[PDB]
Curated annotation (Swiss-Prot):
Family according to the record: Belongs to the protein kinase superfamily. Ser/Thr protein kinase family. CK2 subfamily.
Enzyme Commission designation: 2.7.11.1
Name of this chain's protein: Casein kinase II subunit alpha
Disease annotated for this entry: Okur-Chung neurodevelopmental syndrome: An autosomal dominant neurodevelopmental disorder characterized by developmental delay, intellectual disability, behavioral problems, hypotonia, speech problems, microcephaly, pachygyria and variable dysmorphic features.
Post-translation changes: Phosphorylation does not directly affect casein kinase 2 activity, but may contribute to its regulation by forming binding sites for interacting proteins and/or targeting it to different compartments.
Tissue specificity comment: Expressed in gastric carcinoma tissue and the expression gradually increases with the progression of the carcinoma (at protein level).
Residues bound to ATP: 43-51, 66
Organism encoding this protein: Homo sapiens (Human)
Stated role: Catalytic subunit of a constitutively active serine/threonine-protein kinase complex that phosphorylates a large number of substrates containing acidic residues C-terminal to the phosphorylated serine or threonine. Regulates numerous cellular processes, such as cell cycle progression, apoptosis and transcription, as well as viral infection. May act as a regulatory node which integrates and coordinates numerous signals leading to an appropriate cellular response.
Keywords of this entry: Apoptosis, ATP-binding, Biological rhythms, Cell cycle, Disease variant, Intellectual disability, Kinase, Nucleotide-binding, Nucleus, Phosphoprotein, Serine/threonine-protein kinase, Transcription, Transcription regulation, Transferase, Wnt signaling pathway
Subcellular location: Nucleus
Domain Protein kinase: 37-322
Amino acid sequence: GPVPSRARVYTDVNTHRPREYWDYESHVVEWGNQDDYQLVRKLGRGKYSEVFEAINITNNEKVVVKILKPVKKKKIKREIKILENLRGGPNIITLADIVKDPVSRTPALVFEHVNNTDFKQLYQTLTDYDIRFYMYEILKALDYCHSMGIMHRDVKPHNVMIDHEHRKLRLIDWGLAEFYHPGQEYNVRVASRYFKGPELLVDYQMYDYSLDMWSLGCMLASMIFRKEPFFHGHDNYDQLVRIAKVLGTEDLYDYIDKYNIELDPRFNDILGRHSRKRWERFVHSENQHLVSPEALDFLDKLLRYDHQSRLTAREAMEHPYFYTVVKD
Ligand SMILES: COc1cc(/C=C/C(=O)O)ccc1O
């Protein structure tokens, strides 16, 4: 069988929390008044929810309402409990209220409003300094939630809301987030394809916070190289092949050999043999102003096959890439 794995940090946070903290199935929801919120316009529909701009008529302020689609009560309670646990943490979206929607007959989560410019347009205008700044802000959120025993598991541009006017960032959609418990096996069908870590793609279930750090690395690569997404697979198998064409196949085999993991035999005909590449090959005249030796070293230390080898969020915040970023 597979070799077991543990997070190298925050390993036992939930072990030593009171049970109430991580036992979300027993959580009792405290409901607000649904009539406080007037829906204004639909912003989007995801796989698990519909999102609306709304007004809180008790203060005439903008809010966002997320009306959950029917899922098992645990996943609903999971997201709710995680949002309440993380509330007030750095760059964590603030859950303001929870109400029962009379039409959907499901919970509607009420969030602070973030006046966001969408990432396709925003990423086209970000300067070198902007990328470092916003990366540091994301790391604050990730170190916080990891330090609180929670992995996000769906880090991607869509879930990083940025108000570029006030240089404000919020990590959103905690609907796939989980509590980390040492030795627990998790569903590998998380994250969006382009941001899935090698551990998911080789079906290794005993993963941890470090999954988010791979996803963050995929984001960083897309931003500094101006290629979104960076690893552009046509499915989950091709996704691993695209990664292997960059990180190389020998280190992939070292990874799966370390954990005594077997590749899906369907890779026999598609994987090939690939050298590891140097990151400089992705630099060209239209992205070079976003690239520095510090950026490439930082990227290199996020994008490791071995989840145990990746920078932790805290380690990442110590990286020379962020020396240029003005600290508060
Ligand atoms: C789409 O704009 C927003 C979305 C959210 C939350 C989404 C989620 O948690 O799933 C919060 C504030 C927003 O301004």
